[PDB]
Design an enzyme around this catalytic site. Structure first.
Site, PDB file in Angstrom:
ATOM      1  N   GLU A 261       0.790  -1.219   0.000  1.00 15.54           N
ATOM      2  CA  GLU A 261       0.000   0.000   0.000  1.00 15.54           C
ATOM      3  C   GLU A 261       0.827   1.277   0.000  1.00 15.54           C
ATOM      4  O   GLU A 261       0.323   2.320  -0.375  1.00 15.54           O
ATOM      5  CB  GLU A 261      -0.858  -0.004   1.283  1.00 15.54           C
ATOM      6  CG  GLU A 261      -1.851  -1.138   1.367  1.00 15.54           C
ATOM      7  CD  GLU A 261      -2.966  -1.069   0.359  1.00 15.54           C
ATOM      8  OE1 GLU A 261      -3.753  -1.949   0.211  1.00 15.54           O
ATOM      9  OE2 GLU A 261      -3.070   0.065  -0.268  1.00 15.54           O
TER      10      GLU A 261
ATOM     11  N   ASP B  51      -6.718   6.281  -4.620  1.00 13.64           N
ATOM     12  CA  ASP B  51      -6.198   4.938  -4.765  1.00 13.64           C
ATOM     13  C   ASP B  51      -6.275   4.478  -6.219  1.00 13.64           C
ATOM     14  O   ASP B  51      -6.635   5.263  -7.080  1.00 13.64           O
ATOM     15  CB  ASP B  51      -6.797   3.940  -3.742  1.00 13.64           C
ATOM     16  CG  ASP B  51      -8.242   3.560  -3.966  1.00 13.64           C
ATOM     17  OD1 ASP B  51      -8.846   2.813  -3.247  1.00 13.64           O
ATOM     18  OD2 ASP B  51      -8.780   4.087  -5.031  1.00 13.64           O
TER      19      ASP B  51
END
Ligand SMILES: [Cl-]
Ligand SMILES: [Cl-]
EC number: 3.2.1.17
Length: 164
Positions: free
Chosen positions: A11, A20
């Site tokens: 991440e 994202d």
């Protein structure tokens, strides 16, 4: 290696609100804020999550705190899920980390949907589960990350994450 280091690799860490892979507002270590298209709604969820007026920026400590909460929640979501729990219980420690990673990314609901793959993992048919996991939108949209997670399920080792 462990689940925290694993997810930190997948991440990354960002201290300012960002979008994202799906275009959703997120912050920290993969902490989804909102699926809404509004930056304000995102700033509002951030403040509520941190407990202060943030201005869309957080500190490292704050990021890690949300991260800890998020991993904890992922685990709890698995143990409470009728479909996930039995898989998780059947797996060794390394592979459990792989399942947590998937839940952290796509949610319990999402993962519980991989019916066939779950059954294969439960049966310990590694190669077959790996092929089945790859036949998914998940694999096609985030192939490098999916490959890493799938390799962990296939081998039971952390080799895929060693180098990164
Ligand atoms: Cl929260
Ligand atoms: Cl990827």
């Amino acid at each position: 290696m462990n689940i925290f280091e694993m997810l930190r690799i997948d991440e990354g860490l960002r201290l300012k609100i960002y979008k994202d892979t799906e275009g959703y507002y997120t912050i920290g270590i993969g902490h989804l804020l909102t699926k809404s298209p509004s930056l304000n709604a995102a700033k509002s969820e951030l403040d509520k999550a941190i407990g202060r007026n943030t201005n869309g920026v957080i500190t490292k400590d704050e990021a890690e705190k949300l991260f800890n909460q998020d991993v904890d929640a992922a685990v709890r979501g698995i143990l409470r899920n009728a479909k996930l729990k039995p898989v998780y219980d059947s797996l060794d420690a390394v592979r459990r980390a792989a399942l947590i990673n998937m839940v952290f990314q796509m949610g319990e609901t999402g993962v519980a949907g991989f019916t066939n793959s779950l059954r294969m993992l439960q049966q310990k048919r590694w190669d077959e589960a790996a092929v089945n996991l790859a036949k998914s939108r998940w694999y096609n949209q985030t192939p490098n990350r999916a490959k890493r997670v799938i390799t962990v399920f296939r081998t039971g080792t952390w080799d895929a994450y060693k180098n990164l």
